[PDB]
Design a protein around this motif. Sequence first.
Motif, mmCIF file in Angstrom:
data_model
loop_
_atom_site.group_PDB
_atom_site.id
_atom_site.type_symbol
_atom_site.label_atom_id
_atom_site.label_comp_id
_atom_site.label_asym_id
_atom_site.label_seq_id
_atom_site.Cartn_x
_atom_site.Cartn_y
_atom_site.Cartn_z
ATOM 1 N N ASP G 38 0.811 -1.207 0.000
ATOM 2 C CA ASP G 38 0.000 0.000 0.000
ATOM 3 C C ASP G 38 0.850 1.265 0.000
ATOM 4 O O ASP G 38 0.317 2.353 -0.244
ATOM 5 C CB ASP G 38 -0.939 -0.004 1.213
ATOM 6 C CG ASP G 38 -2.003 1.078 1.138
ATOM 7 O OD1 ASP G 38 -2.505 1.351 0.027
ATOM 8 O OD2 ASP G 38 -2.342 1.657 2.193
ATOM 9 N N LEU G 44 1.909 -1.390 -5.172
ATOM 10 C CA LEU G 44 1.442 -2.661 -5.722
ATOM 11 C C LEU G 44 0.071 -2.943 -5.116
ATOM 12 O O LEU G 44 -0.096 -3.785 -4.235
ATOM 13 C CB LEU G 44 2.443 -3.778 -5.437
ATOM 14 C CG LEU G 44 3.827 -3.604 -6.067
ATOM 15 C CD1 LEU G 44 4.669 -4.861 -5.898
ATOM 16 C CD2 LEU G 44 3.708 -3.227 -7.536
ATOM 17 N N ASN G 46 -2.413 -4.512 -5.941
ATOM 18 C CA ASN G 46 -3.027 -5.827 -6.093
ATOM 19 C C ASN G 46 -2.694 -6.727 -4.909
ATOM 20 O O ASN G 46 -3.588 -7.169 -4.179
ATOM 21 C CB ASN G 46 -2.565 -6.466 -7.404
ATOM 22 C CG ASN G 46 -3.712 -7.047 -8.208
ATOM 23 O OD1 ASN G 46 -3.525 -7.987 -8.978
ATOM 24 N ND2 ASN G 46 -4.906 -6.490 -8.033
ATOM 25 N N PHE G 47 -1.403 -7.004 -4.703
ATOM 26 C CA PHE G 47 -0.991 -7.814 -3.562
ATOM 27 C C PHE G 47 -1.384 -7.163 -2.243
ATOM 28 O O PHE G 47 -1.544 -7.857 -1.233
ATOM 29 C CB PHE G 47 0.523 -8.050 -3.582
ATOM 30 C CG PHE G 47 1.021 -8.804 -4.787
ATOM 31 C CD1 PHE G 47 0.148 -9.477 -5.625
ATOM 32 C CD2 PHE G 47 2.378 -8.844 -5.070
ATOM 33 C CE1 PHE G 47 0.618 -10.167 -6.728
ATOM 34 C CE2 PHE G 47 2.852 -9.534 -6.168
ATOM 35 C CZ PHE G 47 1.972 -10.195 -6.999
ATOM 36 N N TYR G 50 -4.697 -8.486 -1.484
ATOM 37 C CA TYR G 50 -4.656 -9.941 -1.428
ATOM 38 C C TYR G 50 -4.088 -10.410 -0.095
ATOM 39 O O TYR G 50 -4.629 -11.325 0.533
ATOM 40 C CB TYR G 50 -3.830 -10.499 -2.589
ATOM 41 C CG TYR G 50 -3.391 -11.927 -2.363
ATOM 42 C CD1 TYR G 50 -4.322 -12.954 -2.298
ATOM 43 C CD2 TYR G 50 -2.049 -12.245 -2.201
ATOM 44 C CE1 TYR G 50 -3.932 -14.256 -2.081
ATOM 45 C CE2 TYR G 50 -1.648 -13.551 -1.987
ATOM 46 C CZ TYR G 50 -2.597 -14.551 -1.930
ATOM 47 O OH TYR G 50 -2.218 -15.853 -1.715
ATOM 48 N N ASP G 87 9.853 -4.871 8.191
ATOM 49 C CA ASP G 87 8.797 -3.984 7.723
ATOM 50 C C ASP G 87 8.998 -3.566 6.279
ATOM 51 O O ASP G 87 8.023 -3.386 5.549
ATOM 52 C CB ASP G 87 8.718 -2.733 8.608
ATOM 53 C CG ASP G 87 8.434 -3.062 10.055
ATOM 54 O OD1 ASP G 87 7.512 -3.866 10.310
ATOM 55 O OD2 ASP G 87 9.136 -2.524 10.937
ATOM 56 N N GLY G 92 8.962 -6.839 -4.338
ATOM 57 C CA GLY G 92 7.740 -7.609 -4.219
ATOM 58 C C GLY G 92 7.949 -9.100 -4.326
ATOM 59 O O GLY G 92 7.102 -9.871 -3.865
ATOM 60 N N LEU G 93 9.071 -9.521 -4.912
ATOM 61 C CA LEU G 93 9.332 -10.942 -5.111
ATOM 62 C C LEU G 93 9.819 -11.598 -3.828
ATOM 63 O O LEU G 93 9.440 -12.734 -3.526
ATOM 64 C CB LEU G 93 10.352 -11.143 -6.234
ATOM 65 C CG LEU G 93 9.897 -10.909 -7.678
ATOM 66 C CD1 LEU G 93 9.498 -9.463 -7.905
ATOM 67 C CD2 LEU G 93 10.985 -11.325 -8.658
ATOM 68 N N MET G 96 6.784 -12.043 -1.798
ATOM 69 C CA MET G 96 6.156 -13.297 -2.198
ATOM 70 C C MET G 96 7.012 -14.489 -1.799
ATOM 71 O O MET G 96 6.478 -15.550 -1.458
ATOM 72 C CB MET G 96 5.902 -13.320 -3.708
ATOM 73 C CG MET G 96 5.065 -12.171 -4.248
ATOM 74 S SD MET G 96 3.527 -11.895 -3.353
ATOM 75 C CE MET G 96 2.802 -13.531 -3.385
ATOM 76 N N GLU G 97 8.336 -14.328 -1.830
ATOM 77 C CA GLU G 97 9.233 -15.429 -1.500
ATOM 78 C C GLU G 97 9.101 -15.830 -0.038
ATOM 79 O O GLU G 97 9.062 -17.024 0.283
ATOM 80 C CB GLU G 97 10.671 -15.037 -1.824
ATOM 81 C CG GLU G 97 11.513 -16.173 -2.336
ATOM 82 C CD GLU G 97 11.999 -17.093 -1.237
ATOM 83 O OE1 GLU G 97 12.110 -18.311 -1.488
ATOM 84 O OE2 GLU G 97 12.272 -16.595 -0.126
ATOM 85 N N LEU G 100 5.796 -17.802 0.625
ATOM 86 C CA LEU G 100 5.740 -19.227 0.312
ATOM 87 C C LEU G 100 6.359 -20.058 1.427
ATOM 88 O O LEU G 100 5.843 -21.127 1.770
ATOM 89 C CB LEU G 100 6.445 -19.511 -1.015
ATOM 90 C CG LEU G 100 6.080 -18.627 -2.209
ATOM 91 C CD1 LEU G 100 6.576 -19.241 -3.508
ATOM 92 C CD2 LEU G 100 4.588 -18.377 -2.267
ATOM 93 N N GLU G 103 3.736 -20.082 4.317
ATOM 94 C CA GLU G 103 2.566 -20.938 4.163
ATOM 95 C C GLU G 103 2.930 -22.412 4.260
ATOM 96 O O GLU G 103 2.151 -23.204 4.803
ATOM 97 C CB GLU G 103 1.870 -20.640 2.836
ATOM 98 C CG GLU G 103 0.379 -20.388 2.982
ATOM 99 C CD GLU G 103 -0.141 -19.394 1.966
ATOM 100 O OE1 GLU G 103 0.044 -19.632 0.755
ATOM 101 O OE2 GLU G 103 -0.716 -18.367 2.383
#
Lengths: 133, 146, 146, 133, 132, 143, 133, 133, 134, 145, 148, 131, 131, 141
Positions: G38, G44, G46-47, G50, G87, G92-93, G96-97, G100, G103
């Motif tokens: 934000d 970005l 979108n993420f 999400y 923080d 962005g990768l 996302m990295e 993963l 999760e």
Amino acid sequence: STSQVRQNYHQDSEAAINRQINLELYASYVYLSMSYYFDRDDVALKNFAKYFLHQSHEEREHAEKLMKLQNQRGGRIFLQDIKKPDCDDWESGLNAMECALHLEKNVNQSLLELHKLATDKNDPHLCDFIETH
Amino acid sequence: DSEAAINRQINLELYASYVYLSMSYYFDRDDVALKNFAKYFLHQSHEEREHAEKLMKLQNQRGGRIFLQDIKKPDCDDWESGLNAMECALHLEKNVNQSLLELHKLANEQVKAIKELGDHVTNLRKMGAPESGLAEYLFDKHTLGD
Amino acid sequence: QDSEAAINRQINLELYASYVYLSMSYYFDRDDVALKNFAKYFLHQSHEEREHAEKLMKLQNQRGGRIFLQDIKKPDCDDWESGLNAMECALHLEKNVNQSLLELHKLNEQVKAIKELGDHVTNLRKMGAPESGLAEYLFDKHTLGD
Amino acid sequence: STSQVRQNYHQDSEAAINRQINLELYASYVYLSMSYYFDRDDVALKNFAKYFLHQSHEEREHAEKLMKLQNQRGGRIFLQDIKKPDCDDWESGLNAMECALHLEKNVNQSLLELHKLATDKNDPHLCDFIETH
Amino acid sequence: SQVRQNYHQDSEAAINRQINLELYASYVYLSMSYYFDRDDVALKNFAKYFLHQSHEEREHAEKLMKLQNQRGGRIFLQDIKKPDCDDWESGLNAMECALHLEKNVNQSLLELHKLATDKNDPHLCDFIETHY
Amino acid sequence: QDSEAAINRQINLELYASYVYLSMSYYFDRDDVALKNFAKYFLHQSHEEREHAEKLMKLQNQRGGRIFLQDIKKPDCDDWESGLNAMECALHLEKNVNQSLLELHKEQVKAIKELGDHVTNLRKMGAPESGLAEYLFDKHTLG
Amino acid sequence: TSQVRQNYHQDSEAAINRQINLELYASYVYLSMSYYFDRDDVALKNFAKYFLHQSHEEREHAEKLMKLQNQRGGRIFLQDIKKPDCDDWESGLNAMECALHLEKNVNQSLLELHKLATDKNDPHLCDFIETHY
Amino acid sequence: TSQVRQNYHQDSEAAINRQINLELYASYVYLSMSYYFDRDDVALKNFAKYFLHQSHEEREHAEKLMKLQNQRGGRIFLQDIKKPDCDDWESGLNAMECALHLEKNVNQSLLELHKLATDKNDPHLCDFIETHY
Amino acid sequence: ASTSQVRQNYHQDSEAAINRQINLELYASYVYLSMSYYFDRDDVALKNFAKYFLHQSHEEREHAEKLMKLQNQRGGRIFLQDIKKPDCDDWESGLNAMECALHLEKNVNQSLLELHKLATDKNDPHLCDFIETH
Amino acid sequence: DSEAAINRQINLELYASYVYLSMSYYFDRDDVALKNFAKYFLHQSHEEREHAEKLMKLQNQRGGRIFLQDIKKPDCDDWESGLNAMECALHLEKNVNQSLLELHKLNEQVKAIKELGDHVTNLRKMGAPESGLAEYLFDKHTLGD
Amino acid sequence: QDSEAAINRQINLELYASYVYLSMSYYFDRDDVALKNFAKYFLHQSHEEREHAEKLMKLQNQRGGRIFLQDIKKPDCDDWESGLNAMECALHLEKNVNQSLLELHKLKANEQVKAIKELGDHVTNLRKMGAPESGLAEYLFDKHTLGD
Amino acid sequence: TSQVRQNYHQDSEAAINRQINLELYASYVYLSMSYYFDRDDVALKNFAKYFLHQSHEEREHAEKLMKLQNQRGGRIFLQDIKKPDCDDWESGLNAMECALHLEKNVNQSLLELHKLATDKNDPHLCDFIET
Amino acid sequence: TSQVRQNYHQDSEAAINRQINLELYASYVYLSMSYYFDRDDVALKNFAKYFLHQSHEEREHAEKLMKLQNQRGGRIFLQDIKKPDCDDWESGLNAMECALHLEKNVNQSLLELHKLATDKNDPHLCDFIET
Amino acid sequence: EAAINRQINLELYASYVYLSMSYYFDRDDVALKNFAKYFLHQSHEEREHAEKLMKLQNQRGGRIFLQDIKKPDCDDWESGLNAMECALHLEKNVNQSLLELHNEQVKAIKELGDHVTNLRKMGAPESGLAEYLFDKHTLGD
């Protein structure tokens, strides 16, 4: 002592209701036994599996309003053992239906005795109940 | 060997339905006039009855022999108060749930009913049952009325 | 016929019962009492006993007999104490109406009504009536708010 | 003792109200006796047995509204005996009418007259109650 | 015509003849009702019994007109003649006239029921028995 | 622009308030407590406090600040005794969050006023003494 | 030990209590990455929402785990929600990295939580995490 | 001191307390002017009902202030509602000047009350003035 | 058609007088709209009058619409004219705007009064009643 | 000179509000009798009166002077058919919109113009104005809800 | 009496009538006919005529008769051509059912008389709308009349 | 021409027809990714739910643009929706990078679309962006 | 030249019509047996209620079959519903034995339809025999 | 086998033409609101069919290999009846490959046929007022 609502309700009229309750609950058990016999893979007579399951539920509903009637007239519900059916393997669809009708209104000879009991003890309420249901 | 265990669950589940049927029309009596207590155990008796019938289909779908036995009468004709009948129901459900778990060894519904009965017994105790007849009257209306 | 004099005796009894209920209904309408659902309740039973009486009227004409009307004499009380007392009185009144109706049948609306009265008498007692004024208030709201 | 809502409601008003409850229930009773007389098959006047039965209910419901009025102003309801009509058989389709012509007459006379205690004792609420009902 | 089946010409006629009788009876009730409406004749619940009875008779004719079209007959309307008077003496003559006005209106349906029975019209018989 | 860190304190405090209310909610979900409307009430407060923090996070980005996150400390209790006690702790928590919001300046008031009403009612009804009093408040006020 | 406790080991009760804290942790890691995207310098969008949705979903997972704890008879003992590893996720990768690895951190404990419910013969706990995890 | 009071100055409570009386006085004068245009001497219905609407407005503004007082923890202390300066407003024009005078007087009291909240650093009381006016 | 099938007991003077009343109250709604956004300006800012004169502008707009409904209902023909601009845009003081709003009302009411007299002389109970109940 | 462009736009909105008011009560006439055509244009008359007085507040918010003019009567007294009143509305709405885009250099109309076009083609496809049955059905099936 | 032969005749005719309506119903369910409410209309008449037959088999038992069933003959037409035609065939069929019923009463329903009147109403409306030449007429009748 | 077309330059119409195809291409890249993250050998069943939701959401943008085209009097000319650059996104993070590229590529065409609507003086279309 | 017909074999179309009459026949027989137990000299009120429900249920099967015929594009050709083999079913158990044997033959006739739909590669018809 | 991959593209082609026909009726010179609602709904249905096929391949170790969603044959279906007949013919080809791969298709094929029959019987496509009343009475509710 006696209930605050009991009126014109004989002691024999009460025990007959109790013995009637167990008889209807016994019938609901027998039908349930025969119902899942025709549900078996070996039999595959689905026709009477539907019918006997429904009749078992309707026979239990019959016993429930006998219990409601008992409390409604000041009587007292005394429950007894639900004896198991004559067998688990009902042989053939004829024999199961054979044993069915013998029981189907073996209930309504005592039901017609209960009516005679309601008339001879001057119980017009108990009469109108039996005649309706 | 697991076949005979399913037949045990059928009889105990049918036994459970009769106990609740007994409890139901106990609160139908004119000296115990709690209609929502009566509705509750009658709904439970129908539920346990449905649990028994789906165990009979389980015998047929795996080639078992349904061996029905007597449906013994409940331990009581008079269940005293609403709290006590609610405590016996919590007792009964867990015993049914016990044998039900032995069945799976050789389900989700039982845990929900036990949890609710526990909430039921807890509330009635905190309110002052069976001593306060007002407590079992107010619980009848505000909890078991819906 | 001695059923003609018997039926007319029921007509007078139901009309008397309808008067007692009318009297009790507007006792709870008083500012001294202020129990409106108790008022609506006995007012409804007052209109029910009149219907039973008017239904005996056309029965008398259909059987061939003729109506012989007496005085709708007076309720025993102008003050009916509390809600429990009025319910206890209404229970004794219905059993008398039922008593005469049954030995008129010698030549279920009442039986059901007697069950409902005894149920209410039971609840009011177990709630602490008439000593506890909070009880008859809550019974007025949660039970007679039908 | 004296009601907490009792205000400007004279004793003669409370008594005259109590007199109306018995009279309206008397009128309710006479219309009832007349209604079910037109119903017996010795007469067979149905479209008058239905009107008088509805008039019987309306005279009783005026008494109830009077009984509600008695509580509403602090008065205390002291009902009285509902006496039988002058007879059970008015064998004539129209003597009962002349009786009804003159049973309607006499409440409205006492309704026109209860209007005197409300005026002469400066009671506007009781005045306006009759002028509305 | 499309729906007319087992409906005699005298049945259709008597129905039309019965329709006018109900409307006329409604007019007499209306007159007696508003005669009891007077400043002087203060009989006010005989002004709204006859008024309701007047509507009761206008309703009967409507269902009779409904019966006519339903069976296949054709509705022919005639004049609704004046009541025999406007001043009804007082409460009683009105009743005495209303009483006589009733069962001449009422059991001309017996004559109708006699017609439907001699004609063997089970539907028209059931209609007289039910609504009356 | 330690107002950047003043938002950062509030973000953690609202998240702390959310965690506290989350703990209170499932205390009244316990089978030996069993007050579903108490449980609903504090769970709804927990969501509303979480939402308060999330807009604070968006506020700081719109001011060109840095979101510095710290640990959400566990509540002081696992057992909240009763409904009156859990309400009084909530009233303490809300005025705590509120005073930290007012210093950030240089609704919350509705939550404080409502909790004040709840505490007052539970007191006069007979809580925590009367379990009947905490049962009837659950059904009528929190219902 | 509660009224309703039955066939519920305290190993699984402790495992539930642990997984509760694990999903609350993921709820904040997803929340941190959400309002990182934000940021105006990142933007970005979108993420950003999400992760905000997953932040709420992991929160709902722990809530249903908490309800499961009281339902089986266990006792909820909460712990601190440790801060995310950072923080500023920079790219962005990498954000996302880390997502993963996070999760599969919570999906690994779930498999071990499932084995625990199987080693102990808990059909209800197995059916739970089977149903929607 | 109320359990909910927080950052609510005693000068704020007193000012709001006397603000209530001003809005109730404003309701009273708008009530006087409204039924002045209502009489046949002046006989204008356009202003007679709008001024009755304004009287209801100010009464509702005082009620929203009374609700604000309890919401912050302050205590409501009410004084006499002084009568309007006159009951004969001479003409429609004079009353329109009088209405315009007390209108900006009430708004001036609002501008003072808003400055007090800023100087006492009251964002909630500031937001209240800004929103409802 | 060019002949009204519903027109009955609706005089030539009545039909023209309400058309003369359509445009007068449309003018009134535009006068009140001008005043409303005068008390809405920063130079004056009297929100109590800016909202009343806006509400009254809607009221005169509905009065004309109901009169237009009365024209088609009685069978008459609506004849629309221009809506002249108010006498000014800068109403100067807040008391002059009200001085004109008072004078305007005693001409609108002094047009319904003459309209009702016309509805009385031409024996129009329906038009008389419409005025007395609106 | 963005002040007189506002004042021209409020006048064009108020004039167009007088047009829809004229169209609405045309379909209320006893020899036209299209109740939903009357409901439809009466609504557009109000929607554009709102447009006008929300440009008067915009004249004040931007610190301008509101200069009112005469609201001239609509061109036609009868609008003939429902199709022609709809085609005149389309033409009116595009002129109000074109003069609104002149003002944005110193949506509602796009949504209204699109709806007016959807009505014109439907009426033409069904057979308006010749087919009186067509305008009747359009009145109750499209302008009904 | 000779009523036993009349009841069983009435039983068979009602069962036959239920079959004719069943044939009419699924004719309008065909994709080259495609009339939803026409199909629902005759399908309900079919079940109501069958209901009349079962009440007649009951009336035979109460009076002590012997239920003698026969073949349920296939309807006259497989293709019912149009909506106007299908209801005219229904109109006549109900009158034919009603006619033999009026005989039985002398050797139960306004339902027969009112069905005839309703079927008659629909034939009038359909014909005045332009059916069967107007496929729009049958479409609109299927919507605005048989959709109630 | 269209009876409703007004202040709608051809360039605006054609660039919207282009954007329509680009939105549909994106939904579909997101659809291929979604069922890639759904295969049992990839088995990250969380982006599969997210990409599928944005596959639906990116198409809703195209349907909003197609609605916008008719509303302004323009005419919808659809083109082919080309396959994504691959069916195997190799690793899951490599697909998060291709999806990260597309979001900026699509947003870039919207910035050009908004720039086109200002040079030719067109509000509403300018206000269509700013969703 | 149907409009909806697709992969629906001709010998499968008459297989439905032959089944439609057969279901309507069983409903007739069930209706006949139901009103046997309704008599005074039989008095089997429970089995009369059952067979009346089976009569209506086998009627629905035919109705669902006729509906299937139009849905696939076949043309319904109705035949005569032939009378039950007797009106005096003697004993109640003989009626049961005939009702038992009644359509243990249709269930087989239902299975020959499934063997028919399998041989003609009709999954929709195979799927339909789930009732 | 790999026939599923071709059906995935076929359902996606079906969803695309249904989208194209939907927003054709959205045009001002057409203005059939429920015709547009109808074909947009079919576009979202055939799209859902393709996606459930994509999962079906993952549930048997398949490979979702993918081709272009080709442009429909027409940008202009200027007739309600013509769009129905194109939709009826297309569903029978979307159903054509389903029967090779081996319910909700024949239910849609049947419905499209009911629509075509009605519109032709009512006077479409030459008759306006026919497609208008069909939009309001059949596709409306």
